[PDB]
Amino acid sequence: NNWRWFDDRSGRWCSYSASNNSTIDSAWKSGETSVRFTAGRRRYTVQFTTMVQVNEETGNRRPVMLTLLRVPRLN
Amino acid sequence: NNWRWFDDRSGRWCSYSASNNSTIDSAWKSGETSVRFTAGRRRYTVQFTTMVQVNEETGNRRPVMLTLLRVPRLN
Amino acid sequence: NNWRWFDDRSGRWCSYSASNNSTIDSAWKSGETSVRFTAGRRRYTVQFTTMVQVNEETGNRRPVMLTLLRVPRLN
Amino acid sequence: NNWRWFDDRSGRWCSYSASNNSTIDSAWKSGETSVRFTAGRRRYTVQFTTMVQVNEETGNRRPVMLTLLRVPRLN
Numbered sequence: 697n698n699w700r701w702f703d704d705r706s707g708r709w710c711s712y713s714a715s716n717n718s719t720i721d722s723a724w725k726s727g728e729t730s731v732r733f734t735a736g737r738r739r740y741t742v743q744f745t746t747m748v749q750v751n752e753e754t755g756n757r758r759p760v761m762l763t764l765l766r767v768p769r770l771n
Numbered sequence: 772n773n774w775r776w777f778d779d780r781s782g783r784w785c786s787y788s789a790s791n792n793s794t795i796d797s798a799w800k801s802g803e804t805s806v807r808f809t810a811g812r813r814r815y816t817v818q819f820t821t822m823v824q825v826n827e828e829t830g831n832r833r834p835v836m837l838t839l840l841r842v843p844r845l846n
Numbered sequence: 847n848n849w850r851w852f853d854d855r856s857g858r859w860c861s862y863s864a865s866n867n868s869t870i871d872s873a874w875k876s877g878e879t880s881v882r883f884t885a886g887r888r889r890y891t892v893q894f895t896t897m898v899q900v901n902e903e904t905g906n907r908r909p910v911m912l913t914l915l916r917v918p919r920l921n
Numbered sequence: 922n923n924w925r926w927f928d929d930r931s932g933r934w935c936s937y938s939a940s941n942n943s944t945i946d947s948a949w950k951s952g953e954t955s956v957r958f959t960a961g962r963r964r965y966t967v968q969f970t971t972m973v974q975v976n977e978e979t980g981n982r983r984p985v986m987l988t989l990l991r992v993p994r995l996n
């Protein structure tokens with residue numbers, strides 16, 4: 697679960713479901729500029745060119761981030 | 772201009788001023804867990820452990836992001 | 847796909863097979879410090895703390911790298 | 922500091938001198954596709970499009986890497 701979306705109501709970064717994270721990450725690795733996914737009766741588009749998620753039912757925009765692991769890894 | 776903060780009023784990622792971007796990036800590269808800066812006579816702290824900017828007067832939290840350069844570089 | 851090992855004979859970075867790349871990347875995302883994989887019966891270990899692949903039949907150490915895609919993505 | 926070159930005699934990644942690391946990192950941040958630097962009587966070019974250091978006299982190719990900081994930062 698490496699992708700996150702920001703919830704401005706709670707003021708915290710939130711995780712995607714395992715399947716939505718996998719849909720987003722597969723599109724990210726394939727070079728697509730955007731990806732759609734469904735969660736709890738809403739369709740969303742993650743726009744990779746702006747790092748913003750758009751709720752396609754309401755139009756609400758929430759920022760997204762990709763977590764990055766340290767290189768090299770610590771012992 | 773590698774650091775950005777999300778403005779939920781405009782629905783867009785926003786750039787820091789050149790000096791605030793430099794202040795934030797120098798603290799990021801030094802391994803600090805947070806950094807202080809001011810903009811428009813207001814004080815903020817960027818918390819690197821949560822990737823959020825905190826308005827010190829209101830407590831309002833806005834997300835932040837670091838732009839990343841491709842490795843390897845494209846020709 | 848995203849992991850590469852350096853071939854000193856040819857002087858080039860080389861891709862892994864889709865299956866070996868998936869094995870390495872799953873272990874990378876799970877926080878493991880190392881991962882074993884095979885190319886047929888030939889055994890290898892990728893040591894994430896040193897970013898080196900050890901050929902477990904010859905003992906030869908080849909460096910490894912993880913490709914990093916640009917954030918945000920270009921249009 | 923943050924750039925490293927692979928020493929296949931010892932089988933390990935090695936650091937650049939502080940000045941060579943600064944020269945490489947300044948060219949990296951400026952969008953250049955390559956950078957030249959010296960170490961005593963040795964002359965090198967780091968090719969960012971292939972992540973390889975080339976000895977200008979002999980053509981010997983040593984792979985390079987850029988260390989990456991975790992995002993978000995750990996406490």
Ligand SMILES: O=C(O)CN1C(=O)c2ccc(C(=O)O)cc2C1=O
Binds near residue numbers: 711713758
């Ligand atoms: O729709 C809203 O108000 C807020 N919201 C999102 O932005 C979002 C993104 C992904 C998932 C998921 O389960 O993967 C759930 C949600 C969710 O509830």
Ligand SMILES: O=C(O)CN1C(=O)c2ccc(C(=O)O)cc2C1=O
Binds near residue numbers: 810811
């Ligand atoms: O939260 C607010 O008060 C709104 N707001 C910010 O969050 C912020 C951060 C950076 C700069 C800058 O000039 O570098 C300006 C602003 C700004 O207008």
Ligand SMILES: O=C(O)CN1C(=O)c2ccc(C(=O)O)cc2C1=O
Binds near residue numbers: 942960983
């Ligand atoms: O000459 C060798 O055996 C290998 N070798 C290099 O490729 C190299 C590159 C930069 C520096 C430095 O001091 O910045 C040191 C060396 C070094 O020792």
Ligand SMILES: [Cl-]
Binds near residue numbers: 751756
């Ligand atoms: Cl939403």
Ligand SMILES: [Cl-]
Binds near residue numbers: 853909927983
């Ligand atoms: Cl090598």
Ligand SMILES: [Cl-]
Binds near residue numbers: 901904906
């Ligand atoms: Cl070998």
Ligand SMILES: [Cl-]
Binds near residue numbers: 962
């Ligand atoms: Cl000499």
Ligand SMILES: [Cl-]
Binds near residue numbers: 982983
């Ligand atoms: Cl050399």
